[PDB]
Design a protein around this ligand. Structure first.
Ligand SMILES: *[C@@H]1O[C@H](CO)[C@@H](O)[C@H](O)[C@H]1NC(C)=O
Lengths: 49, 24
């Protein structure tokens, strides 16, 4: 790689974030806050997304 | 040498829970 090269021949850094979006316990999460739990009543819910 | 597997070598196919069900 030389800085004089045309755009297609210039270096690009590449990162691939691969997700194991499994039906399995989480270890990486988005910036969500968490509430107390509620029981025996009709609630909207979100567990791990 | 050889031996028979019989019914050995079944494993939980995914990390889900299920009950009372004939899953395929
Ligand atoms: C399978 O195992 C039996 C065990 O008695 C053996 O006699 C036979 O030769 C084996 N056959 C093959 C194809 O491995």
């Amino acid at each position: 790689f030389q800085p004089t090269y045309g755009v297609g021949y210039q270096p690009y850094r590449v990162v691939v974030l691969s997700f194991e979006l499994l039906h399995a316990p989480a270890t990486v999460c988005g910036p969500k806050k968490s509430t107390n739990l509620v029981k025996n009543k009709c609630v909207n819910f979100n567990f791990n997304g | 040498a050889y031996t028979n597997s019989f019914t050995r070598g079944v494993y939980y196919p995914d990390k889900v829970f299920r009950s009372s069900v004939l899953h395929s």
